[PDB]
Amino acid sequence: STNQRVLWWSILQTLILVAIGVWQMRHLKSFFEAKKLV
Amino acid sequence: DKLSELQLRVRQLVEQVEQIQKEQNYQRWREERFRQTSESTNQRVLWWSILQTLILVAIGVWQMRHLKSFFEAKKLV
Amino acid sequence: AAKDKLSELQLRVRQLVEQVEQIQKEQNYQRWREERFRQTSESTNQRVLWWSILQTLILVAIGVWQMRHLKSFFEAKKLV
Amino acid sequence: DKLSELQLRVRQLVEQVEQIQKEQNYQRWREERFRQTSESTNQRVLWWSILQTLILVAIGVWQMRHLKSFFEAKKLV
Amino acid sequence: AAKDKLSELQLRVRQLVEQVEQIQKEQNYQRWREERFRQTSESTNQRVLWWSILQTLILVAIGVWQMRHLKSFFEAKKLV
Amino acid sequence: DKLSELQLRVRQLVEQVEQIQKEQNYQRWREERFRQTSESTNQRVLWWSILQTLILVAIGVWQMRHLKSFFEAKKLV
Amino acid sequence: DKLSELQLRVRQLVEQVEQIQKEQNYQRWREERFRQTSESTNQRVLWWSILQTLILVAIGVWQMRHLKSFFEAKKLV
Amino acid sequence: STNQRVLWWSILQTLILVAIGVWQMRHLKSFFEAKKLV
């Protein structure tokens, strides 16, 4: 059943990288208005 | 009597071959099924690794375009 | 009756030799099947290793390009 | 005579099963060994992937730390 | 001696019967390594036909992006 | 009495062999036919590659033409 | 009286059953090697098609680079 | 032997696409100096 397991990792790795990209995009959005003030 | 002895010997020999052939029935099937499975899994893990790369690159870009579009609209508003 | 009792035995042993040889052959094939599966699976494992490794490079390169295109874009935006 | 001849033939056949049997056993061992190495290969592929995911998140965070830092530097100078 | 003969023959049927049985089992497997393989082959062929379609789209998209980045680059260069 | 059972069982194995040698032939037809199918599938792939290399290059030249008409036409008018 | 012929019927049967066993084996040789070859060649096509995409994209980007590095240097000279 | 016949066509297709890209890259180079004159 390992075969599945690594496949689960592929399908939940994808999710974590997408999540990190979205938070990256949110961090910059929250970073902009502070950058203009400084 | 020698003949008889040969007959006792050939019978045992021919029953130690049913057994041998059945072991090799059983081993083949088992082994091939495992082989199959492993192989298929490797190609899933390599047909999805590539989809994953494609979707990761698209979103990444897309997102940047979104940042250069809604961020740009912020300045006009 | 013993002669018939030897002829049947020589048919049976002939029919045993036939079965054993069809089994030997069988066995040689199984041992050659194995080599092939040690080289298709080896090839696929090498292929997936090269793919993961180069997928890592692709993602890192796109990340760096993304950074360099974003930094200049902010710089350029401030000037106009 | 025939008897003796038959015996000889039979002797050859008798050998030809022990080897076959012996070899079946060898085959079985090797199959199993390969099964075990394939089990370790999937586990080596698994660590790799997770290592890579960690690497990618570290690089995301450095990237985000970095450009932002540069901007800050510009604003302080 | 016939009793002997009959038993040679009843026993004869006993090894042969199993011969057929085994054979039957292998045929069952065979029809199992053919249906399965057909489906496996279909899957792999699907993969190549969809990667083909995917590769074509990737090359076309990169060509269009190349054309849009070159056109603007020349126009921007003329202005500065 | 035993001979009647034996002859029925033998008839009862001839049918099985006949069945088995009938079905084996059916399996052999399934195989040859499959060889024809796999070959046909590879042929389409080849054409699809030469279609895809045709679609790709005309576009290439095509693209270039578009570029000339986006720059050259502006100069004329 | 049938017994002698029963011995014969059986003989015919085992002349054919072994033959079935031979043919069956031959069909598994012929359609085993063929499937490994077909699977291996499709896997290699799919792998090299993927590699071909990577090399094609790399050169494209480098074409851009070289049409902007050396073209840019043309204006300064 | 059709397998070798598809692999060779893949390689030839790679070569032809690279050749078309280079030719493209040469056509624009020969196009520039004419563009500046017009």
Author numbering:
A (entry chain G), H (entry chain H): 198 to 235
B (entry chain A), D (entry chain C), F (entry chain F), G (entry chain D): 159 to 235
C (entry chain B), E (entry chain E): 156 to 235
What do the paper's sentences say?
In addition, all TMEDs share a conserved domain architecture with luminal Golgi-dynamics (GOLD) and coiled-coil (CC) domains and a single TM domain. Sorting signals for COPI (dilysine motif, KK) and COPII (diphenylalanine motif, FF) coatomer proteins are contained in the cytosolic tail of TMED9. Here, we report cryo–electron microscopy (cryo-EM) structures of full-length TMED9 in octameric and dodecameric forms.
In the homo-octamer, the TM domain consists of a dimer of tetramers, whereas the CC domain forms a dimer of trimers; for two of the eight subunits of the TMED9 octamer, the density of the CC domain was absent. In contrast to the symmetry of the TM domain, the CC domain formed obligate trimeric coiled coils, as was also predicted by MultiCoil. Within the TM domain interface, residues L214 and L225 constitute two layers of Leu-mediated hydrophobic interactions. Within the CC domain interface, four layers of Ile/Leu-mediated hydrophobic interactions are centered at residues L161, L164, L171, and I178. The PIP headgroup between the TM tetramers is within hydrogen bonding distance to the R223 and H224 side chains from two of the four subunits at the tetramer-tetramer interface; these interactions could further stabilize octameric, dodecameric, or higher-order TMED9 complexes. In addition, we used mass photometry, a label-free single-molecule technique for mass determination, and found that wild-type (WT) TMED9 has a mass distribution consistent with octamers and higher-order oligomers (such as dodecamers).
